[PDB]
Amino acid sequence: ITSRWLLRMLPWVETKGGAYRVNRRLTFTVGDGRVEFVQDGSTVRVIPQELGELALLRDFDDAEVLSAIADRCVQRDFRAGETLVERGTAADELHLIAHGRIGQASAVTLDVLADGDRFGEHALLDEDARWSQTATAETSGTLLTLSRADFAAVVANSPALRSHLAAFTAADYELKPREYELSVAQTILRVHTRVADLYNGPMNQTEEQLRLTIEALRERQEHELINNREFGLLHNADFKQRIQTHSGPPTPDDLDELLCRRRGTKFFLAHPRTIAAMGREFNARGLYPDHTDLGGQQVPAWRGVPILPCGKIPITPERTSSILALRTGEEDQGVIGLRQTGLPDEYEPGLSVRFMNIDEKAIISYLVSTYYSAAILVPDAVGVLENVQIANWPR
Amino acid sequence: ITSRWLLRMLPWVETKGGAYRVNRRLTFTVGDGRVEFVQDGSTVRVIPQELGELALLRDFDDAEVLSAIADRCVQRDFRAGETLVERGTAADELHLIAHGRIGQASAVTLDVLADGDRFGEHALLDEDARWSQTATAETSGTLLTLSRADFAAVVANSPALRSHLAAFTAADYELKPREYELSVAQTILRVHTRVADLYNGPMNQTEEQLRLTIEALRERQEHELINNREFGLLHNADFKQRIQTHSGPPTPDDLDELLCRRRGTKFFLAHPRTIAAMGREFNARGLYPDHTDLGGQQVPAWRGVPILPCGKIPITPERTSSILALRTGEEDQGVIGLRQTGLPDEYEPGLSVRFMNIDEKAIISYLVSTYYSAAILVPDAVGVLENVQIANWPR
Amino acid sequence: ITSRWLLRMLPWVETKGGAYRVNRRLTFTVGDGRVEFVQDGSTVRVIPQELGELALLRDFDDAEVLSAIADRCVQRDFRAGETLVERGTAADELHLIAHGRIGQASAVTLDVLADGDRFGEHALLDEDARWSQTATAETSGTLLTLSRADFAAVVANSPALRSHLAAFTAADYELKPREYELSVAQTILRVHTRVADLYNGPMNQTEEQLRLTIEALRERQEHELINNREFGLLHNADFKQRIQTHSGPPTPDDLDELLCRRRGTKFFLAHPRTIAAMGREFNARGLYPDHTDLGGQQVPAWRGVPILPCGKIPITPERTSSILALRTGEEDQGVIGLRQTGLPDEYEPGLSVRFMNIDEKAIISYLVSTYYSAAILVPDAVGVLENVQIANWPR
Ligand SMILES: [Ca+2]
Ligand SMILES: [Ca+2]
Ligand SMILES: [Ca+2]
């Protein structure tokens, strides 16, 4: 029953066969100290050529070997405050940071690794490797892991890798299309035959129940567009586009930075609690931002970019939320809503309700289905400001 | 396949939402020695104010206490010849007669209690109470029972009742609406797919089977309109409107009495055996009643009121049946047939046949449904003459 | 003679029969430590299932027993600074907090209970219970009370509760409609016959007196719409929608929070003194809010939501007032004004003036009547900011 801003703001394009294709160019350089990954929603995998940044694999440029090694790493997720490695424990895994920040405390907190950093190099070659630092995850993120035994197996498989290892001991264009498959929001509406036969004259309780079902399906559509893992703006956003607040509350400098990272931002999406926190920051700064009109409706905005409330953005137990800045369009590479219309039996242009059967207990079943998905044409179309403290008040 | 006179004689009114409301006024007086009850078909309950006829509760006029006591009695039914209480057995229950006649034989058959009579008064207060008479049920009927322990509990709950009991030891208008809910006659017609594909050219065995199903549903409708307990003229008729024959055979004096009790009687309903018995009585009296025409059809009548045969009126093993005298109409408060038309998929104006599914065994299922009920607007619209001996011949 | 903003801003819907029905869904969960209540204006009652949060009643799920216990609690209101319980006094009542904050000072001020909190648990079972803390009401509110003797009586009534107590010693959907009945603003206008016969040519002192009567009735309508207890936005607002100021003066952060709690707020209602205090806060913060136009009339606003003055909002002796944020509409679930037009004799579309009689003293009497009420379709349609200090000046 709440407002679904993402449903009414995302342009909808018609897919053919319930699938869409987005052509991705992933420019990366070898030797700059940062490993680049390929991200398909929440699943990430290291580019094989970038594996070479690792010294023990520098100048090795055999596609088979690199592809095998890249295929043999395992993705892991870490939460805030979680310890990944402990001092004293023998080192046996190479960890490549794909997202999040990880603080390493030595025997003296050395520093904080970030996206594209590596720790666990020496663990690959020798068995004497021992963790001398404790890695505490300051922020939630992902991490690729290459175990020593698996790498040893890959070495024992390819003679070229063996020879290169024995010898060492003494902008790239990569096109890879991304395929989006339409997801389904489905439900079964069970209407008793008596309710369909009698209560249908002045108002149809069958039609009202169908309306409630459609509203629930639309709410689920919005919740999935925001929070789904495969597709979904919160998770299917580039790791470079995800920013951290400078202080923790959503100060206007953070909004300026969020607008800096991409051209032609269309709007902001945030929880109403987050919008209240942003308003508190505006009042503290002493500035009164203007309000702009979309669709004949006035709405708060920052620098002319409307800020739209979305209750589907999660609030963590630590009372920290996130803000989304996103541009929408097809002619301008942005975020589109993939949806197929012209279904065989449409109650609504995107919907399909079809009679299933009548049970022995005289209960009619209807199948209400809708097909939807989200596509982000270019990486710099959705930016996420994370760890936004929304329970901060003046003191 | 038999004639359904009640289906074709009862006017049919369209209910909204599958429900109807009848406003009942129940005039009763306190202190006339007769307890009045509220009857909703076959379930009966004593009016709380009338409970006061009982001496141990006279002049007590607390609505809460009377309502609780009325709610705490239990309804029981007794058949003819059944013994309710026996001499010598300790008395612990108050019995209020709602219908039927009960002969009490003392240590000398005293008399016969009838509707509104009470026996078991003293059993309420003291534990010494003992049954000194044997109550044999001469006629089937209902009876409300108030146990000593339950009444003691109600006394222990309300201090006002305690004080009134301690002190004693030393036309009313009551509106209460009656709600009628439409009942359903439903069935599933299973037609094999071969029988629906081939045998459909010169005659449809599917359509003929559907016709047989509809006829069976109509027969069930008539049987329920006569014999159902919630609604149904035999049971949902006022206890005052139910009369007993003076002699046992249906003599014309009984028909005159049946016509006496209500104004504008429309017709009589009786079993064909009962009509034969009435004809035998007419021949014995030497009078030849006239026949009147309804719908261009000649029919036997008494005093111009047609007598219609109904085979759905039960015949008891003792060969005793009943006769119904009833007026029909909406403008004149009588008996109406509640029925909702305009169903989503009507084969007939009151019917609804809908395809359910086709089984793995290639059997098509159809759901044939009809919604019906009966309403009696005023109590004096259906009169019943009971215990009519129909196996009596001249000797 | 003052402006009646609520009368001219609330949409008016036509009730049938002088009554309206609002269907309420009350979602509650058992075991989260908070008791949910059902509120009908100013009268509140605990949901029977929620009673189970209490340990001594956990896992007991008998509807009869819970319903009886819920029915047997008594509602009490407490003012600010009022002491409810005192240390040393024996504990005999269970107090469930429905609204307001209550600070408990032990032998060391422990904490402050709020809506949904309970204190007095142990008092239910044993008679040794003694108050060891003093409860001072920091804010006015309501509180449900379950006495030990009443609970003991309920235990002695139901054997199942007895057995469960003996054994222990060793999202839910609840639909319950709310009915609104139209209230009446009525008055009698006494006009002397001489004043009606002579003073009627250039101006009618009868018509001018009638105009004054109508204005007084409209003022009473507004005062009741604001301050009435059964209906009325100040009292008939959800306990969750009532917020407390962070500091006490109406700072813009409080307005942001008030706008946070509900979607599509239409306008604010506050006393002119409260609006002056809000303006003082705006000047202190150094921000100059814009003004928006409603009905071709410019009005102060916050974030584009107009702030309308209402002199009918009470000012407490401690110089603290309240602010109302409310959205109006029927298509969007909000606040509507229930009113029936088409009266038998209308001087104005909502009014009815009818001649009563002429007294022996030659005084004509007229009855001027209007029927009105207010409905809040969903709980999150009226929010109240309470304890707003309006007598604060820069120092
Ligand atoms: Ca690189
Ligand atoms: Ca009586
Ligand atoms: Ca709860």
Short mmCIF file of N, CA, C and O in Angstrom, two decimals, chain C residues 11-20 182 330 336-343 346 349-350:
data_model
loop_
_atom_site.label_atom_id
_atom_site.label_comp_id
_atom_site.label_asym_id
_atom_site.label_seq_id
_atom_site.Cartn_x
_atom_site.Cartn_y
_atom_site.Cartn_z
N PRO C 11 -11.57 16.77 3.63
CA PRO C 11 -12.61 16.38 2.67
C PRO C 11 -13.80 15.78 3.40
O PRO C 11 -13.66 15.10 4.42
N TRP C 12 -14.99 16.04 2.88
CA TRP C 12 -16.23 15.62 3.51
C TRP C 12 -16.88 14.52 2.69
O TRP C 12 -17.11 14.70 1.49
N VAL C 13 -17.16 13.39 3.32
CA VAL C 13 -17.80 12.27 2.65
C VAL C 13 -19.19 12.08 3.24
O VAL C 13 -19.43 12.36 4.42
N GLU C 14 -20.10 11.59 2.41
CA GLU C 14 -21.49 11.45 2.80
C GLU C 14 -21.72 10.08 3.42
O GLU C 14 -21.58 9.06 2.74
N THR C 15 -22.08 10.06 4.69
CA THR C 15 -22.42 8.82 5.35
C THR C 15 -23.89 8.48 5.11
O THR C 15 -24.72 9.36 4.85
N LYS C 16 -24.19 7.19 5.16
CA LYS C 16 -25.54 6.68 4.97
C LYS C 16 -26.05 6.19 6.32
O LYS C 16 -25.44 5.33 6.94
N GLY C 17 -27.18 6.75 6.76
CA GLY C 17 -27.72 6.40 8.06
C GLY C 17 -27.02 7.03 9.23
O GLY C 17 -27.21 6.59 10.36
N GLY C 18 -26.20 8.05 8.99
CA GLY C 18 -25.44 8.68 10.05
C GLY C 18 -24.39 7.80 10.69
O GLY C 18 -24.15 7.93 11.89
N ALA C 19 -23.76 6.91 9.92
CA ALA C 19 -22.75 6.02 10.45
C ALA C 19 -21.77 5.67 9.35
O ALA C 19 -22.12 5.66 8.17
N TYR C 20 -20.54 5.35 9.76
CA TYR C 20 -19.46 4.98 8.86
C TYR C 20 -18.70 3.82 9.47
O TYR C 20 -18.67 3.66 10.69
N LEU C 182 -22.20 9.69 13.66
CA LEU C 182 -22.19 11.14 13.50
C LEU C 182 -22.63 11.83 14.78
O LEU C 182 -23.68 11.51 15.34
N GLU C 330 -9.54 10.42 0.61
CA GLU C 330 -10.27 9.17 0.58
C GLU C 330 -9.59 8.14 -0.31
O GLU C 330 -9.45 6.98 0.09
N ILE C 336 -10.75 11.83 6.90
CA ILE C 336 -11.93 12.32 6.21
C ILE C 336 -12.91 12.89 7.22
O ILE C 336 -12.90 12.52 8.40
N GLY C 337 -13.73 13.81 6.75
CA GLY C 337 -14.79 14.35 7.55
C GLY C 337 -16.12 13.74 7.19
O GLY C 337 -16.64 13.95 6.09
N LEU C 338 -16.67 12.94 8.09
CA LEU C 338 -17.96 12.30 7.87
C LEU C 338 -19.06 13.32 8.13
O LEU C 338 -19.11 13.93 9.20
N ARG C 339 -19.93 13.52 7.15
CA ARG C 339 -20.99 14.50 7.27
C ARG C 339 -22.10 14.13 6.31
O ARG C 339 -21.84 13.74 5.18
N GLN C 340 -23.34 14.25 6.77
CA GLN C 340 -24.51 13.90 5.97
C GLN C 340 -25.24 15.16 5.55
O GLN C 340 -25.65 15.96 6.40
N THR C 341 -25.40 15.34 4.25
CA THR C 341 -26.14 16.46 3.69
C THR C 341 -27.53 15.99 3.26
O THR C 341 -27.95 14.86 3.53
N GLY C 342 -28.26 16.86 2.57
CA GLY C 342 -29.61 16.54 2.16
C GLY C 342 -30.57 16.40 3.31
O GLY C 342 -31.44 15.53 3.29
N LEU C 343 -30.43 17.25 4.32
CA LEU C 343 -31.30 17.22 5.48
C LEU C 343 -32.69 17.73 5.10
O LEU C 343 -32.85 18.41 4.08
N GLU C 346 -32.86 22.50 4.95
CA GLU C 346 -31.49 23.00 4.98
C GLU C 346 -31.47 24.49 4.69
O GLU C 346 -31.89 24.92 3.62
N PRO C 349 -26.09 23.69 3.02
CA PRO C 349 -25.98 22.28 2.62
C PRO C 349 -25.75 21.29 3.75
O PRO C 349 -26.22 20.15 3.65
N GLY C 350 -25.04 21.66 4.81
CA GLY C 350 -24.85 20.74 5.90
C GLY C 350 -25.74 21.00 7.11
O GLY C 350 -25.76 20.20 8.04
#
